[PDB]
Symmetry: C4
Subunit: 465 residues, 4 copies
Amino acid sequence: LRRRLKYFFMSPCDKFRAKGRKPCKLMLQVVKILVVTVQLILFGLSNQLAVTFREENTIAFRHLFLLGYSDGADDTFAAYTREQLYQAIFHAVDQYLALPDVSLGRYAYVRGGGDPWTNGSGLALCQRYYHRGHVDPANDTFDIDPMVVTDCIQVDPPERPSYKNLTLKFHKLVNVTIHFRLKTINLQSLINNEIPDCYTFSVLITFDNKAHSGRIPISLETQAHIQECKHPSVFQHGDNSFRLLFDVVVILTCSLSFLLCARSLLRGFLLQNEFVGFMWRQLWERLEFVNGWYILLVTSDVLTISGTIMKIGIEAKNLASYDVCSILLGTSTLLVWVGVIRYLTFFHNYNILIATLRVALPSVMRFCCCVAVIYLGYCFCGWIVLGPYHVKFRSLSMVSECLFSLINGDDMFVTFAAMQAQQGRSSLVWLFSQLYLYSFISLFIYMVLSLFIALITGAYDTIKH
Amino acid sequence: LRRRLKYFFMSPCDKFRAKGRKPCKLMLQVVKILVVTVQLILFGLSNQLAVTFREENTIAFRHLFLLGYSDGADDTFAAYTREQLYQAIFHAVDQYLALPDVSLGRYAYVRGGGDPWTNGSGLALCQRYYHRGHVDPANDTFDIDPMVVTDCIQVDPPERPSYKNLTLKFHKLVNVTIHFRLKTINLQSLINNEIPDCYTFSVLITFDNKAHSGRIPISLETQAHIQECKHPSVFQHGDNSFRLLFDVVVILTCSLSFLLCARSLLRGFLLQNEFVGFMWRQLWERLEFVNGWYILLVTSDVLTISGTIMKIGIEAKNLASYDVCSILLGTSTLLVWVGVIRYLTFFHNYNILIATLRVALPSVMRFCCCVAVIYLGYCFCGWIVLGPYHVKFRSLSMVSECLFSLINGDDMFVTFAAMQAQQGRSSLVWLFSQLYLYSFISLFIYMVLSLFIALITGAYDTIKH
Amino acid sequence: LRRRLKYFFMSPCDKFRAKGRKPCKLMLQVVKILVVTVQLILFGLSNQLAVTFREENTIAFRHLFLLGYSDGADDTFAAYTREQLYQAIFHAVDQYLALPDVSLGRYAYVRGGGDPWTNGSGLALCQRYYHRGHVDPANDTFDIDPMVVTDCIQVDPPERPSYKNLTLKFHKLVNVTIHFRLKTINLQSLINNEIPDCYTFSVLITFDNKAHSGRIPISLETQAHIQECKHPSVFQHGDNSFRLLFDVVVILTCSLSFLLCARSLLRGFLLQNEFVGFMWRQLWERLEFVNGWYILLVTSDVLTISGTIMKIGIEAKNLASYDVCSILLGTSTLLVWVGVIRYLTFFHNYNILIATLRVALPSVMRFCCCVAVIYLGYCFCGWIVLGPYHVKFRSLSMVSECLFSLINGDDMFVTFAAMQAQQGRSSLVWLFSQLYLYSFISLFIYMVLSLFIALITGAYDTIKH
Amino acid sequence: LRRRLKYFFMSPCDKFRAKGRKPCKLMLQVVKILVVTVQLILFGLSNQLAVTFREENTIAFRHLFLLGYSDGADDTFAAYTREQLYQAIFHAVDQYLALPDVSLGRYAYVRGGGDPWTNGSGLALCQRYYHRGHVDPANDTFDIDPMVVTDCIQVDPPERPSYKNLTLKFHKLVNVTIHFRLKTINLQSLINNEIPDCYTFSVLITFDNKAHSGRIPISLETQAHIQECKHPSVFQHGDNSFRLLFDVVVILTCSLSFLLCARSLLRGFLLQNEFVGFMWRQLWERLEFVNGWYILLVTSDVLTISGTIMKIGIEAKNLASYDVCSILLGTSTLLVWVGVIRYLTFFHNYNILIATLRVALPSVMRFCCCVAVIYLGYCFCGWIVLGPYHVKFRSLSMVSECLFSLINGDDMFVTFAAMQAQQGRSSLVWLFSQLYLYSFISLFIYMVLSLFIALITGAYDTIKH
Ligand SMILES: CN(C)S(=O)(=O)c1ccc(S(=O)(=O)Nc2cccc(Cl)c2N2CCCCC2)cc1
Ligand SMILES: CN(C)S(=O)(=O)c1ccc(S(=O)(=O)Nc2cccc(Cl)c2N2CCCCC2)cc1
Ligand SMILES: CN(C)S(=O)(=O)c1ccc(S(=O)(=O)Nc2cccc(Cl)c2N2CCCCC2)cc1
Ligand SMILES: CN(C)S(=O)(=O)c1ccc(S(=O)(=O)Nc2cccc(Cl)c2N2CCCCC2)cc1
């Protein structure tokens, strides 16, 4: 029983010395490191193809339909005169009508079946304005009914083998939007021997006048919908037997690993039950009886199996979720690579990181319990006060990123100098920004981070003795 | 009496064990954390609306009135020929006269009632020059009377249901300025259900020839003056009863918290007086009798109350001070979030930061007493010497920011390379910059910051034992 | 024998005290420091000339042959309409045909003798397309044979004392490439008194349609082939006797140093053999009998000799491998400068770095054995998942550089903000990027790097006592 | 005698306790801190005026005379066709001839009296080419005589109340340069009440064809020569009695401080002599008898006096050396501010920095003796090898700056990614750059800097006990 515990907690090498047992688990892990990473790279090929197709098509759409658009300046691209706005709208519609003989890609028109489009309509030109707006800055009066009324113009694609009478209602205009859909085939998914899928891009061009500030920003956004094409033909394409068989091999390897890990977990549970019965005959250690590396391994096994099933679906053309498949496979690869420290824990010369973390975690958790309220106060204050003026405080996640980078001494002078323009106008906000940044930087770089590192190194000093 | 001191210095949990007292103060603080942050976000909505309106209107004005202006290049935008200057001025005036049928926003003209404008004048075209200037570089002579004479041209807005004869006097010109005012309504303050305010933008276009260097920079600045509109009408607007009631709720919560904190402070003062009388019967500790977290809490309470009153005024349209209101509310939110460490001080496992700071503060103050004179010497020297040549040393605050960023290892190579242009011309200044930067960086990163962190970590080592 | 060991392990100064022996080895090293660095600089002159000629010629070719090309934007330079593509191609060919009377450099045409060019052809205009492509996005069908067929047009340079009928086959176009060669003489290799070499630039202009996304990027790449000119004449050029004699001097100095170092190594081997025989009469220390600074010195000697031979070949016009010669000479210079710490090892006040490294190396190796699997897991995951979306994760080496910079707190906010565009589209990938970056930064800056520095400083603390 | 030593080494406060002596030296230092800084700022005003005039005039000259010049792109501005070069040259000459009626500044022409200009010539148009050049890349031959022949065209300014026949000899052209001088008056030196000086700008426009690579960069450089104008007149200018009297006050304060410091030094020398005589009756401590703060104070006094004399000369219009005056005054201000630590040395609670440095200096010097050879090897290798390819390794000072910034973790990813272009072409150089950067960063950030900080903190630990 005590020798049973000895055997159960023995290292793999001394286990092999004891019973001449070849570490089948270790061999499975070693081959798992290679198979999971190879599968991740092979999937990454197709993921790159799909993302590249989407992004390059969006860039081509911007250059085709936005008048005067240049690379960069996706923001700071607006209309400032009525003639500029009219020219932008009419250029977008004209380029839509002239696509098939001016574009470098081959696109197909989608006749209306959806929300803005009527039957036969390919492009919907909608302007939205207040139901009743009497804006008169001269007499400081306005009688406004802020109910948005939508007025759409339907444009039919030319049939080859009205929209220019648009009055825009500038004083109460909310926004002008252009909706159309384009079908295209991802032919680049042919160097990878996968067959080309059929894509449908839903293009939305927005002329945003919600601020009513005399500046109307213009943006173009696309949504891509992948689906299989109808009875396609590729000359001597062949099969992807190798890809399918490798996916099956990865599935089987991860299944064997999962089964062995679950068997070891259940054996440890039975031994824990027997030992607690022994003690009763004669609750923070019975949990210590359990192996957390096996929890990590089973989590990684289920992640890899889910990712491989999703990838098989993607290659069989049913489920087009490249982001989900990539996230699953990448997380499983990371956990698989991390899980080899398990065989460095026994040596006591190689597990310095693991032992130091195990000792340092509670103190770090309490220190974080305090630093969290400090950090959240600073985040909320910075967000709300400096957000309208600072480009790095626009949203809460952006504020968190900026402050976390400042703690590590990144972009400090840029953060300071993004308010030199406000030094002259809103000098009070500029002075508040100075005090806020100086206080946060001093307190967190010099007082808090020092104590964090001190806790970690003190735990290391405890471990090494 | 000693048990009275025991009770007075007991933690909240042991206080509840002692007298079964529910920590009403703690409950008030907990709900205060939520109410103050929610109020800060709700105010931030309107603050964002106002700041966005101002900035976007200024950008639209720049693009409308500055000839050849593009986004970016707010600096490095100048005239270099007489024809360029004349075209810029005439384009600005022509765009002013053509606004109502070319701009995307709706603006109203303001007839003259102020400093540069006469009765009926909307735009004032003023050039300023020396009273008598005879500049003759050929004979190296000049008879100059440097009294600035102002010559203004008044332009009346077109009345719909002379300025081109401007001689500019280039050889003694000081500056040319264009003044006009525009009224507009912030209609975007309607998605927030607040009613639109009436704004008046005072636009100033400056053609600055003060350097007399053949380059005349052009800039546009605006001042926005918010006021309520006259008898406006919004169809089914409703009230902001919820906003007003939540402001009242925040006020009442902060008032209760302030009253409890002041009661505890006065009780502690009475106990201190009683104890000192006891000692006299039988001055750095009687102050220690006092709670600094209650000082922080009362400061936060008064800040929150002032901010809420100002916000109520803003929503009632009387006081338009968004920067002051935002600064008050953000500072109060930061202090409110910081004030929960007060309940982590008792545990002795969570107040590592507070104890380390309490021990480390005096040594840090003395070390700063020395490093302050070192830092100020470096700041003044850098400012005056490298200011004309370095873009990051233009002003004293900018020098302080640059040096503080250099201490944290930020923008080091950019700071070094901003003088590669001066390596060839003013090689002496380039060499001085090299020595200055190397010396400052070495001395402060390696000698001073190391001792600062050493003081803080030594105080931590004192605390943890 | 023991006094023999004393003499063999004595420092140079005490050796001179013992036998009055002038350290000829030390003198050779001292003069070697100067000769190797001077030779490296002298070679760097010619290396700079050659690299400058190549790069400036490539820039001139880009500006000459790429229509609408501006400095910068080597990427983000593409065609988006059929007319743009045709104009770019025809402009490239027209500039090729008009070079000799429009270019600022003097170039010669190379009639065809190679792969794309026929006899007499100077420029080859090749378009590549699928052998059979029936792309029809309207019916979601395609009958494709993905065998690339090449169609080349041959252009003959004008003879001074057809290509415009190009149909491009857009729907199945793979790429369009322009191949031509230009000969020129590097006249700038005359201020260095070396004679001008004759260069042949092979220019390749690519119009890449492999993505079939409606955007065709355009790039220009050149390959330079250096060779000696036929019977050139420079008036009173003179010889490079000084350069050749200095190369011979460097060779002789390094040869003497190599001979002395090998003699000392063989003497140490003989002494080790004698001592081990002594012990046998009476395996990790017999290797310690050996001097690793002499291994470093012989490696540096052979590197310097190889580099000098290659440099002599370069100046004698036979072997044009400037990159190989520069790498050899620079590595030898670095090792030569490093090799003077050998005379600081004896003092025990100056070899703190060497002793600390000697003590700290094994623990660092084991810690790296663990951190390597952690780092590789993170690298693979980041590469495959964030590569399509993040500009700093495009390739595996780029991922390694990005993560290594993040460990040192560089470009943190830029890395975080390169996904704000994906926050809206692919919010799942944006959230994964947030978690990935936060986890990696925390774990490696705060836990791993702290323990690395702790190991190094603990080894130092061991040494200093 | 021993009480004499007690008095001589007593602190100022205990000296005042001893003999009731008011610290006149301390009072002089305190007023010196203010007077020197005020003088530095007052001089910085005029220094800023002069530097601003020079730089803005150079910018105006660039925009006036360089065809197609835009802000930025001072580099990457070149000609690539013969027509571009001719148009640039002719535009420069035409703008020179049309200055007085197109420029915004008032300039005067300088008829020839110097090197390139003949009598009456204002502009010299010189082209330089090889004396005999027969460049023939077709036959791989050239008969060249590399003696530069200069051919200048003289242009006379128009007389108001030939250069277009320029043949450029492209195949053997070395460079084309345009020389002319312009006189102007710095009128901005009138808001400071200093009178305007007369400036003479020597403009040099270079068309550099030294590389013979088909790309000819174009640059403009100016040299400014300040001198007093002839009998100028400013209406009611007044005197600068205040400035002169304040300069005299600074001179007198620094003179009194210097006299007291030298008296104390000589008294200490006499006491040292007496003590050594005492010891002889009964050499590293007799130097310790001396005060280094008095050496620093006398250095600062002589620097301030020299700077004030130079500033008086500048304001009296004799010596125009603003860079020298600024460097002297700024260095003196820095030393003056540093010299107050002298009164914090006695307290033993405020001189932690000084004591730590005094203890740590020798070990730091030896560690630097080793790290210096390591750093120099890396600097030379990086310079010569990566210089032609990396933008941050172009010169030796730039290499030193880049490596020093890398040690502090600055611009790491930018330094890594400046070779992604060379990954494809010169992959060997790219791989060498990878190895070089990784090795340098690891060795210096993790091994060397750690031991440097360890030495400094160990000296602090010695001091604090
Ligand atoms: C950055 N330093 C180590 S710090 O200055 O000492 C510090 C700052 C902020 C907190 S936190 O409680 O607010 N949590 C938090 C918030 C944002 C980003 C992150 Cl990664 C964190 N983590 C810190 C590491 C453990 C996991 C949580 C704690 C310490
Ligand atoms: C940056 N390091 C910790 S440092 O190199 O050791 C150091 C530098 C400068 C001084 S200072 O006396 O001049 N004060 C000062 C000046 C500018 C910005 C700031 Cl935040 C400060 N504060 C330092 C932290 C406490 C509050 C004051 C002291 C230490
Ligand atoms: C950066 N820190 C010191 S670290 O966070 O503690 C750390 C990170 C990564 C590893 S590694 O095992 O993966 N090796 C590795 C991978 C990429 C670049 C480099 Cl230079 C290395 N070297 C680290 C220094 C010794 C030589 C190898 C180890 C420590
Ligand atoms: C940067 N760290 C502290 S370091 O990695 O430990 C280190 C790097 C380089 C040397 S050096 O001997 O080559 N001298 C040197 C060369 C360039 C710039 C500078 Cl500021 C220096 N100084 C270092 C501080 C004292 C004065 C000299 C020494 C230490």
